[PDB]
Structure 1
Amino acid sequence: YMGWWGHMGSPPQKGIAGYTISPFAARPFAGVVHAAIFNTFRRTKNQALFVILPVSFFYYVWTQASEKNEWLYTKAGRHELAKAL
């Protein structure tokens, strides 16, 4: 499924013209400030839920479990610990 240069396995290409300029002719950091702020904000906003939802759920579950475990091993939690074991 992959060939090599000259016969890479692409369907025939035709009709596309590609253009570019030398690295010495270009500003490598052109538009860096706009990208760093606006592009990153757009990219982050669109992915935020896929991180927030699972992280917040599993952090909540952990927090509840760790707090219960702590409470069960106090004096106040003696009776509930006895039942839990």
Structure 2
Amino acid sequence: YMGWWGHMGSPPQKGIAGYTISPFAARPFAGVVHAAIFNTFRRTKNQALFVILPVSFFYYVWTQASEKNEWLYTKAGRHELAKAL
């Protein structure tokens, strides 16, 4: 499913003109400030929920479990611990 240079296995290409400029001719950091602020914000905003939802759920689960465990091993939690074992 992959060839090599000259016969890579692309369908025939025609009608596309590609253009670019030399690295010496370009500013490598052109538009860096705009990208660093606005592009990153767009990129992050669109992915935020896919991180926030599972992280917040599993952190909540952990928090509840660890707090219960801590409480069970206090004096106050003696009776509930006896039942739990």
Q: Same fold (TM over 0.5)?
A: yes
Q: Percent identity?
A: 100
Q: Deviations over 1:32-82 (max 9, x none)?
A: 000000000000000000000000000000000000000000000000000
The TM-score with structure 2 as length reference comes to: 1.00
Structure 1, gaps ≥5 residues long: none
Structure 2, gaps ≥5 residues long: none
Structure 1: 4+ residue segments shifted above 2 A: none
- Count of matched residue pairs: 85
Aligned ranges for residues 24-43 of structure 1 at < 5 Å?
Answer: 24-43=24-43
**In 2, Cα distance between the equivalents of 1:75 and 1:4?**
72
Q: 1:28 offset after TM fit, Å?
A: 0.1
Q: 1:2 offset after TM fit, Å?
A: 0.1
Q: Deviations over 1:12-38 (max 9, x none)?
A: 000000000000000000000000000
Q: 1:84 offset after TM fit, Å?
A: 0.1
The TM-score with structure 1 as length reference comes to: 1.00
**In 2, Cα distance between the equivalents of 1:43 and 1:30?**
19
